[PDB]
Design a protein around this ligand. Structure first.
Ligand SMILES: Cc1c[nH]c(=O)[nH]c1=O
Ligand SMILES: Cc1c[nH]c(=O)[nH]c1=O
Lengths: 284, 282
């Protein structure tokens, strides 16, 4: 626990647009044991109402001019985190502080994102069994006061296993695969795309990178994994990634699937996790 | 200077903007663009476009379910970039590809963001004369194909000088020209003690922020090094015009009200808007 939080009479959650004085956190959020997050505010809101209908209109808890949205259904908190580790870390710091003030222990963070697939069919759900950087290292890197810091990523494998076994008892119109996940600090160059505004490498060099990743167990590629699975473990919580793929990066770079098909693909992680939450006291 | 792989594509999908090269006639529709104004909020960047439009003589060009928004007022483009370098780089890659397809050359990018101030009053407009990382290095760091890559940051100092002179002829707040730190986190990397995790003392914190100030740093945000390194590499120009919402030499919390934050956040727009008016922006 950060000692300095006690010094504050009031703690302002700038990006969520509320403070500790806005409501009683223990009474408001104390029952929360699941936190579901994704890059889109619209999609996470769409997953939220889905859970609410299963449980029994979901209203935004966050402020009007806030950067992020915040929803609650029974023991589940819903929030968006934008794109990239820095933005995710903003969400992570303020949500985990929220859990602290609320008296929430051993909460499971679940990221429901989209990703580029490696050697898998588009629309495939990938359960990360590890989150690594572009060098396939199981760490998130930070620079604190100008000093280099590394924090190892820890995926909740027991929950991953339960999710995999659940998918076998379900009839989802897609595959559920357990495999590693690369987090990158860019959508184009760092992910080895050839169709960025800048490209300093060849197709051959690209495939050598992606193929090597695939043969190392990597099945998808996104932009927040290493932050989430490092931060939560360090704050006494658990984290998993449940991401659908929108393209097979071993074949292409472009997102060629239609807007409708993408929406349907993006809704697939919610199908699995939503059933998981229903069966694991996420909702009543 | 030009990524050759682009020509190999029959159609280019701007995934995060929700359109393609077959959506419009890029040379015809955007060929005139000489300005691109960006910030982290879609709501704010739209309002600034609305303010520019009324000043000129706004509808979203981006897709309905797209990550970013896109507006165009005369020779100016408007788009959001979310928060942080990776999010900015997504905006930067797809916008600069748009410009490439449109035949736009030597475009000035203008980031109108918010920031934490150093040694300056809250509400101060800081004109970046340099953008550096947390180690005060004028570079953006990337890991491309698992390999370390460094790209130097270059601010359009000529435009910066002109902006300062313009502000002197307009401005209740101060307009300061100083260095700007880009950080990959709002809390720990920015030396805040009020994050969920804190591994340093205030003595080490003060030493860090004070040693930044005396090095000419006046504010701190999260996208600078990305923008001022990417645009130069793509043959374009970039500046940062960011308001401060707190004096980090005094505290970490954003204690000002939402209304006051909104007023502060609209201040860069006020200065930039006039500049654009007097430099054939509208
Ligand atoms: C489809 C996709 C989503 N997010 C990523 O980071 N990469 C991708 O390829
Ligand atoms: C107010 C503020 C905005 N953006 C930042 O990156 N830091 C800050 O302190």
């Amino acid at each position: 626990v950060n000692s300095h939080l006690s010094e504050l009479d009031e703690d302002v959650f700038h990006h969520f647009g509320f403070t500790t004085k806005s409501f009683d956190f223990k009474e408001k959020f104390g029952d929360v044991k699941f936190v579901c997050v994704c890059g889109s505010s619209g999609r996470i809101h769409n997953f939220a109402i889905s859970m609410a209908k299963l449980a029994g209109p979901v209203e935004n808890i966050a402020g009007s001019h806030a950067r992020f949205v915040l929803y609650k259904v029974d023991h589940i908190l819903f929030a968006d985190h934008g794109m990239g580790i820095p933005s995710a870390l903003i969400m992570l710091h303020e949500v985990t502080k929220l859990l602290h003030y609320a008296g929430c222990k051993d909460v499971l963070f679940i990221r429901l994102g989209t990703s580029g697939g490696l050697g898998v069919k588009p629309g495939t759900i990938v359960l990360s069994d590890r989150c690594v950087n572009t060098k396939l290292e199981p760490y998130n890197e930070l620079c604190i006061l100008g000093k280099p810091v590394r924090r190892q990523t820890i995926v909740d494998l027991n929950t991953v296993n339960e999710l995999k076994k659940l998918s076998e008892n379900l009839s989802l119109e897609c595959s559920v695969v357990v495999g590693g996940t690369i987090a990158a600090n860019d959508f184009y160059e760092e992910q080895g795309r050839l169709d960025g505004s800048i490209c300093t490498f060849s197709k051959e060099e690209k495939l050598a990178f992606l193929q090597s990743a695939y043969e190392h167990g990597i099945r998808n590629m996104e932009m927040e994994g290493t932050a989430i699975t490092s931060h939560c473990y360090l704050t006494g919580h658990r984290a998993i990634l449940v991401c659908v793929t929108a393209v097979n990066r071993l074949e292409g770079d472009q997102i060629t699937i239609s807007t409708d098909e993408f929406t349907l693909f993006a809704q697939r992680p919610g199908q699995l996790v939503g059933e998981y939450l229903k069966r694991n006291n996420g909702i009543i």
